Amino acid sequence: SKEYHIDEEVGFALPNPQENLPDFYNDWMFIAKHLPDLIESGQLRERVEKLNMLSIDHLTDHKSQRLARLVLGCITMAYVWGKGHGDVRKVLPRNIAVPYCQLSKKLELPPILVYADCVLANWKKKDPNKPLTYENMDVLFSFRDGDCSKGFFLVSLLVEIAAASAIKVIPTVFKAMQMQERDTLLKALLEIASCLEKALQVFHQIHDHVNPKAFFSVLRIYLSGWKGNPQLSDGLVYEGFWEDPKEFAGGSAGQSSVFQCFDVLLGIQQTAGGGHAAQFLQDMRRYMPPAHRNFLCSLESNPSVREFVLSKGDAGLREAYDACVKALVSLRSYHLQIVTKYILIPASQGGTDLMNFLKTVRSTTEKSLL
Numbered sequence: 001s002k003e004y005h006i007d008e009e010v011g012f013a014l015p016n017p018q019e020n021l022p023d024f025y026n027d028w029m030f031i032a033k034h035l036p037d038l039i040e041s042g043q044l045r046e047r048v049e050k051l052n053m054l055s056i057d058h059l060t061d062h063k064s065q066r067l068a069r070l071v072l073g074c075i076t077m078a079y080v081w082g083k084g085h086g087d088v089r090k091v092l093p094r095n096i097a098v099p100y101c102q103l104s105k106k107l108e109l110p111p112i113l114v115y116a117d118c119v120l121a122n123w124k125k126k127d128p129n130k131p132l133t134y135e136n137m138d139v140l141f142s143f144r145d146g147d148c149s150k151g152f153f154l155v156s157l158l159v160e161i162a163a164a165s166a167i168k169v170i171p172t173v174f175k176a177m178q179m180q181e182r183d184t185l186l187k188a189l190l191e192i193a194s195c196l197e198k199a200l201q202v203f204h205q206i207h208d209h210v211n212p213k214a215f216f217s218v219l220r221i222y223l224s225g226w227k228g229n230p231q232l233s234d235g236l237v238y239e240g241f242w243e244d245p246k247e248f249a250g251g252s253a254g255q256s257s258v259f260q261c262f263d264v265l266l267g268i269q270q271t272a273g274g275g276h277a278a279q280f281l282q283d284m285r286r287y288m289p290p291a292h293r294n295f296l297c298s299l300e301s302n303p304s305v306r307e308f309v310l311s312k313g314d315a316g317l318r319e320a321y322d323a324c325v326k327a328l329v330s331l332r333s334y335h336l337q338i339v340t341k342y343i344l345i346p347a348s349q350g351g352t353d354l355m356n357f358l359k360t361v362r363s364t365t366e367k368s369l370l
């Protein structure tokens, strides 16, 4: 997978993110690295105000611009959401909202934190000679002490890596189909299935490393955005950049390129529908890189691997391809069992509309089994 920026190890995730910035930018990174101690102690929406309009010009290699977008990113979430209890800033200062929106529009992205910012870039290996697990990794950044953003981004990150096992497989699937190689292809769809059958046991650590209460009450509030949120019905001013408030999505895994690519591949049309479910995940393609866009693009340009299985009436492929769509339902049936532990049960101590979405989606998967 050429200039699609796909790692043959961590896939869509960014490989060995930058842990540190240039020195030209050290009063960014000092906020960013003491956001709990500072939000709490109130001087954060006093310390932010008192900064000056830096310029992107210095940021050279990728990882820099990216980590830079992470840093600006969460600082915006602390400034806007405050202590995370309802005193909401509807104005992002001239001075923080101009290098953030340049650094963003440099990377064809929107000025707000995303999936690729705070799961795909926000990580480091504790020892860069052992392997990528929970016990040998740590996040760069967090919002408040005891929010578990270790558990969230790390577990969430770990999975996207278990799907990468199957991304290096896509190249060979369509090869088999073209050169017509019934055998070769049946394999690729079983490897592809084999991975997501495992990216499930990944998901299980969530229960070891996150707390229902902490995720519903703490994290979530800082991840929200200003699109259809009612605390900022009109959006968020971006000072000396848009005199008009600008709505933007919260941060969702609806911005992840794996899953979205495996629906593309497996002929499951989650984008097509006009329904709320499918309108969203199309408008989240925006909140994804460009290079991870143009890969879901070149997939959808590909001949439906579903059709080519239906035809052949070859109960082998018929079965192997169902293994992949069995795999994907399996996972979103878990991802609903977590959401009831981690958003519904606590909310009883917006709501539903979230689960309908997540079911609307489990379903459209199912209805592609042969």
Ligand code: HEM
Pocket (backbone or CB within 6 Å): 155, 156, 157, 159, 160, 203, 206, 210, 215, 251, 252, 253, 254, 255, 256, 259, 332, 335, 338, 339, 342, 343, 354, 357, 358, 361
């Ligand atoms: C406590 C943990 C989690 C909670 C509360 C949660 C909740 C949600 C919610 C409410 C949505 C709907 C979009 C939104 O409202 O933002 C969503 C979408 C999504 N989540 Fe999760 N999730 C969790 C863990 C994970 C993990 C570990 C993964 C994968 C690594 C994941 C992958 C996704 C994906 C891919 C979507 C969008 C695709 C779709 O709609 O099927 N989530 N999640």
Ligand SMILES: Nc1cc(Br)cc2[nH]ncc12
Pocket (backbone or CB within 6 Å): 114, 115, 118, 119, 156, 223, 251, 252, 253, 254
């Ligand atoms: N809303 C979300 C934000 C982030 Br980052 C990751 C996620 N996983 N599942 C949901 C969700």
